Motif scaffolding. Structure first.
Motif, short mmCIF file in Angstrom:
data_model
loop_
_atom_site.label_atom_id
_atom_site.label_comp_id
_atom_site.label_asym_id
_atom_site.label_seq_id
_atom_site.Cartn_x
_atom_site.Cartn_y
_atom_site.Cartn_z
N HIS A 291 0.43 1.52 -9.46
CA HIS A 291 -0.84 0.81 -9.38
C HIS A 291 -0.63 -0.69 -9.10
CE1 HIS A 291 -3.27 4.26 -10.58
NE2 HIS A 291 -2.40 4.50 -11.55
N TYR A 292 0.18 -0.99 -8.10
CA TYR A 292 0.56 -2.37 -7.83
C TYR A 292 0.31 -2.79 -6.39
CZ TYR A 292 3.22 -6.69 -8.69
OH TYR A 292 3.62 -8.00 -8.82
N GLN B 64 0.81 -1.21 0.00
CA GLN B 64 0.00 0.00 0.00
C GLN B 64 0.86 1.28 0.00
OE1 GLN B 64 0.01 -2.26 2.46
NE2 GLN B 64 -0.26 -1.31 4.49
N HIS B 65 2.13 1.14 0.36
CA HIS B 65 3.06 2.28 0.38
C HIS B 65 3.88 2.46 -0.87
CE1 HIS B 65 2.86 2.02 5.03
NE2 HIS B 65 1.88 2.76 4.54
N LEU B 66 3.79 1.52 -1.81
CA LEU B 66 4.42 1.74 -3.11
C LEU B 66 3.84 3.01 -3.73
CD1 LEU B 66 4.40 -1.87 -4.61
CD2 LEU B 66 6.41 -0.60 -3.85
N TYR C 8 -6.50 0.62 -0.73
CA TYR C 8 -5.45 0.59 -1.77
C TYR C 8 -5.88 0.04 -3.13
CZ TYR C 8 -4.75 -4.02 0.47
OH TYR C 8 -4.93 -5.26 1.03
N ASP C 9 -7.07 0.46 -3.57
CA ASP C 9 -7.61 0.08 -4.88
C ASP C 9 -7.45 1.20 -5.91
OD1 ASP C 9 -9.44 1.87 -3.97
OD2 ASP C 9 -11.23 0.68 -4.34
N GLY C 10 -6.79 2.29 -5.51
CA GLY C 10 -6.56 3.42 -6.41
C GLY C 10 -7.77 4.32 -6.64
N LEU C 11 -8.85 4.08 -5.89
CA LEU C 11 -10.09 4.83 -6.05
C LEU C 11 -10.48 5.47 -4.73
CD1 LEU C 11 -11.96 1.88 -7.81
CD2 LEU C 11 -10.78 3.79 -8.97
N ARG C 12 -11.18 6.60 -4.80
CA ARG C 12 -11.63 7.30 -3.59
C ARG C 12 -12.44 6.40 -2.64
NH1 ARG C 12 -16.87 9.06 -2.62
NH2 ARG C 12 -15.80 10.22 -0.94
N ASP C 13 -12.14 6.49 -1.35
CA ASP C 13 -12.93 5.81 -0.34
C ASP C 13 -14.18 6.61 0.02
OD1 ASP C 13 -10.77 4.11 -0.45
OD2 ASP C 13 -10.44 4.08 1.73
N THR C 14 -15.28 5.90 0.23
CA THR C 14 -16.52 6.51 0.72
C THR C 14 -16.39 6.77 2.21
OG1 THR C 14 -17.45 4.29 0.94
CG2 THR C 14 -18.09 5.54 -1.01
N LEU D 81 1.79 12.17 -2.34
CA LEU D 81 2.68 11.79 -1.23
C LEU D 81 1.98 10.88 -0.23
CD1 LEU D 81 4.58 15.18 -0.47
CD2 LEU D 81 5.46 13.14 -1.67
N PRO D 82 2.60 9.75 0.14
CA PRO D 82 1.97 8.97 1.20
C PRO D 82 2.10 9.69 2.55
CG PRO D 82 4.01 7.93 0.50
CD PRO D 82 3.76 9.05 -0.46
N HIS D 83 1.00 9.70 3.29
CA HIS D 83 0.93 10.37 4.57
C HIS D 83 1.33 9.39 5.68
CE1 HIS D 83 -1.60 12.34 7.93
NE2 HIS D 83 -0.41 12.91 7.87
#
Ligand SMILES: *[C@@H]1O[C@H](CO)[C@@H](O[C@@H]2O[C@H](CO)[C@@H](O[C@@H]3O[C@H](CO[C@H]4O[C@H](CO)[C@@H](O)[C@H](O[C@H]5O[C@H](CO)[C@@H](O)[C@H](O)[C@@H]5O[C@H]5O[C@H](CO)[C@@H](O)[C@H](O)[C@@H]5O)[C@@H]4O)[C@@H](O)[C@H](O)[C@@H]3O)[C@H](O)[C@H]2NC(C)=O)[C@H](O)[C@H]1NC(C)=O
Ligand SMILES: O=C(/C=C/c1ccc(OC(F)(F)F)cc1)N1CC[C@@H]2CN(C(=O)c3ccc4[nH]nnc4c3)C[C@@H]2CC1
Ligand SMILES: [Ca+2]
Ligand SMILES: [Ca+2]
Ligand SMILES: [Cl-]
Ligand SMILES: [Cl-]
Ligand SMILES: [Zn+2]
Length: 804
Positions: free
Chosen positions: A383-384, A376-378, A686-692, A739-741
């Motif tokens: 997109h991996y 999830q930090h890549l 970590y699906d590359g899409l906005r979370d609800t 940037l990863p937080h």
């Protein structure tokens, strides 16, 4: 069992696949060991070679020859590709001047221009220039057709992931082929290059071009070829198919070459032994182009010349061993090579802690040639992460290097001088694209693009509707003479509120204080205009972003910046601001250090509070618009509004502060002003899409303030830099990051030093396309420019790589 007692008589390279136990005669029969006893005899003929000679012209038809030079060969559709040159005084295709193909010049019965995909394995981008002298056919295609300087592959830059991305327009995380070798934990099975497991359909997700073609009534030649079928037989088979009757003739074809990859591994990318495989590819291309010219199709067929990935110098002595880092090296499984993937050796081990594995692999040697990551930090551009076959632990390996588990794995399992698989932004990994034909443009260079975009284009070239994929349809319209797809902006789903002053100070109980009481009709009416959006055409240069999902949010105007504030997430979705070249950096004055002010336009119930940050010892806060860039001491008070504030780990604040205080100004100087849009990203799954809202996994302690996983900025200016960002008449230029937080700076081994030694390097690693941010936020940018929508889609797929 397979009862292979039947015959291939008149069935050589059949297009429909027959079932057990009847024997097969297709180009895949060998790989299934299901061929008929006479397959080789009848279909794989070699007698007399592949070229006509002077004596052979007007010969009697011997049906045991590989190809024919007889009078009736054009009718039968099986002449040697050089027949017309030797026997009819015709010229080779390469020797002809190239004439623009303004309209398709197709024989009767051809409903559409056919498409031929000529794939080449390991064909590094730089071969087009460096081998040009020995590839005259390819050089003709390139200079007369449409070409990019290079095409970017997907990560990992491996064969199976990239060929299947080409076929599907999908990221490997989505199509399922995440490597040449995979373990699926649900199947409890392994996918390998060697073995029969790779054949089960359960590994292959998505919808590849040949399935898309079929479902829509467009016939496909079989894409895959058996290794023992010589390239010459592959070209003739395709040319034979092109002679079939209208109702039988496929509209889409594929050819594949294992070169130059095969030689590349042995000899390195530029070994003196590389000249010959390059010579050979070009000859194969000559044979196709001559053969098409015979069939009067060389000005009718669209040909794509495309590679899967490049090739790097790699050797055995450049291998990092995990046994030099770990004590318990036997409790892990490693997928090795140009990328590392680690998991537990026993699937259900309780006392397996990936935290200690990561820690053991972090900045442990001054010279370390790999970096460990939780997936999830890549970098989000890779997109991996979003596949169960992608192990939690990942090692990004330095170009030119390998990772292995123990030394015995390398010496008892040097022979090789080349390899591939590294980060897809690496120069040596870039590959090739050329398009030639009636539908492609004439003598046209296009900017570099990503291979995920081609599926849409191949669908367009064939009149097909693409399955849903990761391409941005319309971003490659500029490759084509005639476009079958007109892209259109998505409609805004949520419209903003425009709140005015509605709340008094005393209504707020936020635990926030500010020293702001220190304090005319002219400049009080002036600043009211700012809150009404008088300066909005300065700080919002391309229109407001559109919100493409259902939500409640407010547009907030200020002198120096504009924001889209979310009442759900209690922070902005976006913050937009322009910094001109002339603009100056100031500091946060001494009395305003802890200043956080209530926003009288936004209710206490829809605001953050300072008390939560006081109580949460792990979490501090930062500001989306930087106080350091306020245009006046009075305007700086705006930067301290509770509605400009976002949760930030102290570790991350070091990165962010340096970006806001130093980098923005530097960019504005170099680019002649910049427009900046910044905001939070929430991607816990970590699906590359906005979370609800109901997927948030982390809050600032005892509040409803969600913690972002990432922070983005989109930095736009004028492509013609003689013009300021805010008065640009032409094309735009952009760079973005996500940037990863993170609560630590363990990723940056030099982080104990000054921010000027490491921060910008970290940002470069996490470079991103505007389109990546769109997926992650549900927003849609550049809604109001003077540029065409196609050009804007191209702009949105741009990635600034920082490679030389
Ligand atoms: C890149 O582009 C793709 C395609 O547009 C986007 O992926 C799509 O995302 C949506 C929203 O999350 C998914 O819809 C949900 O999924 C299911 C239905 O899923 C089934 O039906 C579809 C349609 O035929 C099928 O493609 C799916 O196939 C998946 O599952 C197979 C195994 O069961 C597997 O073989 C195949 O590779 C694929 O797996 C991938 O997706 C799943 C999630 O579905 C994921 O767990 C896995 O790790 C893989 O990534 C499946 O049979 C509905 O019930 C839900 O309501 C919801 O609508 C699509 O399924 C999904 N499509 C594909 C092809 O993956 C990406 O989001 C986009 N990425 C970015 C970054 O923009
Ligand atoms: O027949 C095809 C392609 C069809 C196609 C053609 C076009 C295409 O693109 C599309 F779909 F867009 F048309 C996709 C697939 N094959 C490609 C797949 C594999 C690759 N392979 C290897 O042995 C191999 C090569 C390089 C390596 N480096 N390191 N290990 C390696 C292992 C065996 C097999 C050959 C058959
Ligand atoms: Ca390959
Ligand atoms: Ca998500
Ligand atoms: Cl730190
Ligand atoms: Cl939501
Ligand atoms: Zn290879």
């Amino acid at each position: 069992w397979t009862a292979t007692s039947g015959s291939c008589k008149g069935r050589c390279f059949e297009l429909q696949e027959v079932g057990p136990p009847d024997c097969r005669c297709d180009n895949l029969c060998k790989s299934y060991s299901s061929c008929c006893h006479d397959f080789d005899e009848l279909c794989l003929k070699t007698a007399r070679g592949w070229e006509c000679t002077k004596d052979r012209c007007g010969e009697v038809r011997n049906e045991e020859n590989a190809c024919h030079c007889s009078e009736d060969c054009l009718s039968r559709g099986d002449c040697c590709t050089n027949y017309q040159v030797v026997c009819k005084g015709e010229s080779h295709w390469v020797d002809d001047d190239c004439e623009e193909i303004k309209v398709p010049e197709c024989p009767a019965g051809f409903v559409r221009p056919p498409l031929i995909i000529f794939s080449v394995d390991g064909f590094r981008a730089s071969y087009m220039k460096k081998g040009s002298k020995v590839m005259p056919n390819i050089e003709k295609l390139r200079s007369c057709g449409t070409h990019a300087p290079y095409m970017r592959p997907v990560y990992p830059t491996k064969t199976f992931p990239n060929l299947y991305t080409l076929a599907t327009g999908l990221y490997p995380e989505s199509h399922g082929i995440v490597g040449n070798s995979m373990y699926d934990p649900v199947f409890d099975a392994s996918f390998h290059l060697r073995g029969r497991e790779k054949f089960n359909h359960r590994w292959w997700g998505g919808q590849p071009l040949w399935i898309t073609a079929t479902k829509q009534g467009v016939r496909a030649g079989t894409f895959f070829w058996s290794v023992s079928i010589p390239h010459e037989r592959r070209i003739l088979t395709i040319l034979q198919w092109l002679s079939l009757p209208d109702n039988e003739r496929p509209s889409v074809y594929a050819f594949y070459s294992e070169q130059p990859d095969f030689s590349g591994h042995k000899y390195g990318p530029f070994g003196p032994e590389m000249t010959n495989p390059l010579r050979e590819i070009d000859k194969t291309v000559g044979q196709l182009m001559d053969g098409l010219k015979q069939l009067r199709l060389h000005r009718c067929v669209n040909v794509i010349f495309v590679g899967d990935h490049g090739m790097e110098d790699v050797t055995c002595d450049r291998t990092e061993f995990l046994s030099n880092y770990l004590t318990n090296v036997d409790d892990i499984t490693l997928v090795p090579g140009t990328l590392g993937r680690i998991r537990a050796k026993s699937i259900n081990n309780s006392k397996y802690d990936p935290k200690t594995i990561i820690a053991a692999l972090t900045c442990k040697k001054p010279d370390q040639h790999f970096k460990p990551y939780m997936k999830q930090h890549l970098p989000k551009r890779l997109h991996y992460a979003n596949n169960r076959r992608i192990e939690d632990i990942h090692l990004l390996v330095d170009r030119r290097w390998h990772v292995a588990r123990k030394p015995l794995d390398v010496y008892k399992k040097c022979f090789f001088q080349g390899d591939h698989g590294f980060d897809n932004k690496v120069n040596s990994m870039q590959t090739v694209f050329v398009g030639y034909g009636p539908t492609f443009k004439y003598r046209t260079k296009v900017p570099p693009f990503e291979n995920i975009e081609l599926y849409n284009v191949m669908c367009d070239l064939l009149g097909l509707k693409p399955a849903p994929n990761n391409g941005t349809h319309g971003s490659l319209n500029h490759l084509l003479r005639t476009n079958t797809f007109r892209p259109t902006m998505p409609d805004e789903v949520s419209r903003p509120n425009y709140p005015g002053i509605m709340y008094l100070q005393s209504e707020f109980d936020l635990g926030c204080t500010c020293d702001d009481k220190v304090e005319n009709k002219l400049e009080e009416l002036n600043k009211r205009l700012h809150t009404k959006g008088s300066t909005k055409e300065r700080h919002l240069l391309y229109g407001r972003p559109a919100v493409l999902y259902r939500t409640s949010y407010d547009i907030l105007y200020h002198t120096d910046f504009e924001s889209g504030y979310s009442e759900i997430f209690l922070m902005p979705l976006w913050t937009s601001y322009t910094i001109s070249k002339q603009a100056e950096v100031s500091s946060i004055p001494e009395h305003l250090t802890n200043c956080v002010r209530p926003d009288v336009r936004v209710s206490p119930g829809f605001s953050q509070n300072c008390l939560a940050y006081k109580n949460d010892k792990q979490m501090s806060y930062g500001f989306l618009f930087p106080p350091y860039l306020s245009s006046s001491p009075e305007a700086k008070y705006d930067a301290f509004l509770v509605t400009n504030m976002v949760p930030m780990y102290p570790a991350f604040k070091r990165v962010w502060a340096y970006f806001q205080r130093v980098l923005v100004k530097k960019y504005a100087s170099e680019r002649n002003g910049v427009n900046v849009i910044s905001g939070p990203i929430f991607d816990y799954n970590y699906d590359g899409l906005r979370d609800t809202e109901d997927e948030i996994k982390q809050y600032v302690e005892g509040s409803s303030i969600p913690v972002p996983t990432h922070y983005y900025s989109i930095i736009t200016s004028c492509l013609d830099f003689t013009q300021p960002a805010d008065k640009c008449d032409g094309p735009l230029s952009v760079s973005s990051f996500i940037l990863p937080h993170r609560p630590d700076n363990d990723e940056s081994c030099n982080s104990s030093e000054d921010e000027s030694k490491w921060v910008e390097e970290l940002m470069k690693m996490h470079t991103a396309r505007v389109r990546d941010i769109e997926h992650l936020t549900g927003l849609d940018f550049y809604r109001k420019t003077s540029r065409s929508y196609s050009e804007i889609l191209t702009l949105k797929t741009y990635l600034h790589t920082y490679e030389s």
